C-alpha cells in the first residue's frame, strides 16, 4: 500500500491515485516574488477558543490530533474563504534532518516540518461529504523551523511515546491548538489537494508566512515514531512529506504586502 519508501513513495502514488498528476496538486513551491498581493483578501479568522481535542492517533503515516467536529467549536473563516470550516484534526509532516521536512517550500526553501490544521466546510454537513467537493476543505499550513522550543507543542511531544507504532492511540483531551500558532496570520493562498493519498482536490490552502520555532529535541522526538505496527521491524517515521508538484494553471495570492 502507499507510503514514503523507495517502492511505494510519492513517485508511485499515481498508479492507485491518478489524480496525483492532476491540475491542482499539493504541495507547491511558493515563489514569493510571483505571488501577487490581493487587497480583496480578508483577514483570517481563527476561532479556537472552544476547541475540544479528543485523541491522538498514529495512523502509520503521521499522527493526527483529533477534535470534536459535531458542533461549531473550532472554526476557520474569512481570509479567502466563503463560509465556515470546522477543525477536524491536525498533523505534521517532517524530515529525517533539520534541513528538510516541509511540503510547501518558500523560494525553494525547505523547513524542518509543516503543521496542517484540517478544516471542513460546514455547508457539506460532514467531512466525508466535504471531500467530494472542490471547496470542501481549508487547510491552514504552518512551517516549523528549528530554534527555540515551542511551549505549546510540548504536550504533543510528551505523548508520542504512548503511540509509537501504527494503529496506537491515546486520550488527548483539553489540548489548546492556539499554542501552535505564530504571531502573524499573514498568509499565501491557492487551490490544491491533500498532500497524501487519496490526494483529493478539495483544499483551499492557507499557508502562514511566519514559521513557528520548535527545539531540536522536539523534532527529534517526532522522528522516534514508527511507520510500522507493534511487533514489526522498526521503520522510523521520518521524511513523510511529498515534494513540490507543478503549479500548472494556478496563482498564489498574498494577504500582505
Ligand atoms: C485530511 C488530510 C489527511 C492527511 N493529510 O496529509 C492532509 S494534508 C489532509
Ligand atoms: Zn498534511
UniProtKB/Swiss-Prot annotation:
Activity control: Activated by X-ray, histamine, L-adrenaline, L- and D-phenylalanine, L- and D-histidine, L-His-OMe and beta-Ala-His (carnosine).
Location of Phosphoserine modifications: 162, 169
Binding positions for substrate per the UniProt entry: 195-196
EC number: 4.2.1.1, 4.2.1.69
Localization terms from the record: Cytoplasm; Cell membrane
Effect seen on changing residue 114 to Q: Strongly reduced activity and sulfonamide affinity
GO function terms (MF aspect): arylesterase activity; carbonate dehydratase activity; cyanamide hydratase activity; zinc ion binding
Cofactor note: Zinc. Can also use cobalt(II) with lower efficiency, but not copper(II), nickel(II) and manganese(II).
Annotated protein name in UniProt: Carbonic anhydrase 2
Taxonomic source organism: Homo sapiens (Human)
Lineage start: Eukaryota, Metazoa, Chordata, Craniata, Vertebrata
Amino acid at each position: 500500500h502507499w507510503g514514503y519508501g523507495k517502492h511505494n513513495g510519492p513517485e508511485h502514488w499515481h498508479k492507485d491515485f491518478p489524480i496525483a498528476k492532476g491540475e491542482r496538486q499539493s504541495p507547491v513551491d511558493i515563489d514569493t516574488h510571483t505571488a501577487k498581493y490581493d487587497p480583496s483578501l480578508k483577514p483570517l479568522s481563527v476561532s479556537y477558543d472552544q476547541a475540544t481535542s479528543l485523541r491522538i492517533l498514529n495512523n502509520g503515516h503521521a499522527f493526527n490530533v483529533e477534535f470534536d467536529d459535531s458542533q461549531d467549536k473550532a472554526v476557520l473563516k474569512g481570509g479567502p474563504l466563503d463560509g465556515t470550516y470546522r477543525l477536524i484534526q491536525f498533523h505534521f509532516h517532517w524530515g529525517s534532518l533539520d534541513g528538510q521536512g516541509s511540503e510547501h517550500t518558500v523560494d525553494k526553501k525547505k523547513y524542518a516540518a509543516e503543521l496542517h490544521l484540517v478544516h471542513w466546510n460546514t455547508k457539506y454537513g460532514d467531512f466525508g461529504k466535504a471531500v467530494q467537493q472542490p471547496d470542501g476543505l481549508a487547510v491552514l499550513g504552518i512551517f516549523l523551523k528549528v530554534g527555540s522550543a515551542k511551549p505549546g507543542l510540548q504536550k504533543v511531544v510528551d505523548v508520542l511515546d504512548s503511540i509509537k507504532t501504527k494503529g496506537k492511540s491515546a486520550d488527548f483531551t483539553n489540548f489548546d491548538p492556539r499554542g501552535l500558532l505564530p504571531e502573524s496570520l499573514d498568509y499565501w493562498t491557492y487551490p490544491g489537494s491533500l498532500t497524501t493519498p487519496p490526494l483529493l482536490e478539495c483544499v483551499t490552502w492557507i499557508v502562514l508566512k511566519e514559521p513557528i520555532s520548535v527545539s531540536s529535541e522536539q523534532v527529534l522526538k517526532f522522528r522516534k515514531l514508527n511507520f510500522n505496527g507493534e511487533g514489526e521491524p522498526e521503520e522510523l517515521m521520518v521524511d513523510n512529506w511529498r515534494p513540490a508538484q507543478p503549479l500548472k494553471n494556478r496563482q498564489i495570492k498574498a494577504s500582505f504586502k
